[PDB]
Write a protein that binds this ligand. Structure first.
Ligand SMILES: Cc1cc2nc3c(=O)[nH]c(=O)nc-3n(C[C@H](O)[C@H](O)[C@H](O)COP(=O)(O)OP(=O)(O)OC[C@H]3O[C@@H](n4cnc5c(N)ncnc54)[C@H](O)[C@@H]3O)c2cc1C
Ligand SMILES: COCCN1CCN(C(=O)c2nc3cc(C(F)(F)F)c(C)c([N+](=O)[O-])c3s2)CC1
Length: 427
């Protein structure tokens, strides 16, 4: 049932034509993978979720791409064990809606709810609550992985095959196809947050606010970041922090249904940006994230700098604003401890996501950012990358050789392959 399709990431860049399989039948996907294995490998096969990754990890030029979104069955949700058993193609919006009546909450939510469970694991996604909860991989209790040999492995975070489990987490689909998974959810009594808002005046006090220990008082924390204004205004931020509300914290009107889902403006945004104990629904707490692809002519760039290299981070921010490249929408947060996945993006430190409009000199400038981020012990995120080099990536991820070793043991014939894998020499 494979049909030739032109495929891009969310950034609408680096297009490549591939045969796309779209079937809700698990057995047809098993046979398709076996067909590629009989061909000796050839150009290979990669899975694809909802295509929300900006880069080229979910495309395979001249090869096979398997669309996983038809596998969207939620098998079971259990309130006692807090476990959900879902097909890899169900998305986080669907899962959120289904789990709420059980008093359960998706443990890690990204900027958009239009991502699959498969895409969430393969990119080891992070959210507003990383410092308290880690990334998506931390909450996977088991996953069924279709490997190159045609076998479906039941993988767990500990015990036998634990190394393959952690190579799959953040593995960008290069260990096989996640068909099914069990996620441990977070218990909640409401669908609401209690939020404290703060507005900083400078990069200095933005960093001070994140270093004074106040982060330990909130499970959820992220900020909108100024990367255009000259110092000391550079790095000023609207910080939104909070935790899941309990029932009695809700206004009476909401208590019946707790689990139901210019210069003058800046003056206001400074005043209305400071608040304490505000009840907010999911949409409001993530606002304005609510407002088939994203806009073309934009280059998404996300990197994290280790906590200790604070001066190094401050310098990169300065380089960005003095560059002639302007990014209006910037998300900033302090990451918590990393997990044991070799290719996992998040490490403890200063994370920022910037959005440059595609202009003359941009490509070579972000190459200079790569070098700076690399020098200072940081890394960029694969789910946003389509232009960095193998050399830079390998140096940014010192456990990459460890990961490649696992990949070669599970896929010797290179049955699983993508545009990213070839570009970053992970193939
Ligand atoms: C507006 C926006 C906001 C975002 N905010 C955040 C954020 O806050 N935090 C964050 O971490 N990320 C964020 N992202 C990125 C996004 O969460 C990831 O790129 C995610 O992996 C995309 O999910 P997807 O289902 O679209 O997967 P795709 O983009 O289709 O694929 C991505 C990778 O997952 C693999 N994959 C997909 N399904 C399977 C499967 N069944 N088995 C094996 N491998 C599979 C593919 O091989 C590919 O390598 C954001 C993206 C957008 C567009
Ligand atoms: C309409 O254009 C707005 C730009 N959007 C916002 C920034 N973009 C993103 O990919 C991100 N969304 C979020 C959303 C969050 C959130 F706080 F969880 F919501 C976090 C913590 C990050 N992050 O990397 O720290 C990001 S990065 C790109 C899309």
């Amino acid at each position: 049932t494979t049909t030739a399709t032109r495929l891009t990431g969310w950034g609408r860049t680096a297009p490549s034509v591939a045969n796309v399989l779209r079937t809700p039948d698990a057995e047809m996907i098993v046979k398709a993978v076996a067909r590629v294995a009989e061909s000796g490998g050839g150009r290979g096969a990669i899975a694809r979720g909802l295509g929300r990754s900006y880069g080229d990890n979910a495309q395979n030029g001249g090869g096979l791409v398997i669309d996983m979104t038809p596998l969207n069955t939620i098998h079971s949700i259990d309130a006692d064990t807090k476990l959900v058993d879902i097909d890899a193609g169900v998305n986080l919006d669907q899962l959120m809606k289904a789990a709420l009546p059980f008093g359960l909450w998706v443990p890690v939510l990204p900027g958009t709810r239009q991502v699959t469970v498969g895409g969430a694991i393969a990119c080891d996604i992070h959210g507003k609550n990383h410092h308290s909860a880690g990334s998506f991989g931390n909450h996977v209790r088991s996953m069924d992985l279709l490997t190159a040999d045609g076998e479906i492995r039941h993988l767990t975070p500990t015990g036998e095959d634990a190394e393959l489990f952690w190579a799959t987490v953040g593995g960008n689909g290069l260990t096989g196809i996640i068909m099914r998974a069990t996620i441990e959810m977070t218990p909640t009594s409401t669908a609401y947050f209690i939020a404290d808002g703060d507005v900083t005046a400078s990069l200095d006090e933005t960093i001070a606010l994140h270093s004074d220990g106040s982060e330990a008082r909130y499970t959820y924390s992220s900020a909108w970041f100024d990367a255009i204004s000259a110092p000391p205004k550079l790095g000023r931020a609207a910080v939104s922090r909070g935790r899941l509300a309990t029932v009695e914290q809700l206004p009476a009107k909401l208590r019946s249904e707790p689990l139901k889902f210019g210069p003058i403006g800046e003056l206001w945004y400074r005043k209305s940006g400071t608040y304490r104990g505000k009840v907010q629904n999911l949409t409001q707490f993530y606002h304005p994230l609510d407002m088939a692809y994203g806009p073309a002519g934009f280059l998404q760039y996300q990197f994290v700098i280790p906590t200790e290299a604070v001066d190094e981070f401050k310098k990169i921010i300065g380089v960005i604003q003095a560059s002639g490249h302007y990014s209006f929408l910037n998300v900033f947060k302090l990451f918590g401890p990393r997990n044991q996945a070799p290719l996992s993006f998040p490490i403890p430190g200063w994370n920022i996501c910037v959005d440059f409009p595609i202009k003359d000199g941009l490509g070579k400038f972000v190459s200079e950012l790569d070098r700076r981020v690399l020098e200072f012990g940081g890394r960029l995120y694969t789910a946003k990358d389509s232009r960095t080099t193998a050399e830079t990536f390998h140096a940014m991820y010192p456990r990459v050789d460890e990961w490649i070793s696992v990949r070669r043991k599970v896929d010797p014939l290179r049955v699983f392959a993508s545009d990213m894998a070839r570009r970053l020499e992970l193939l």
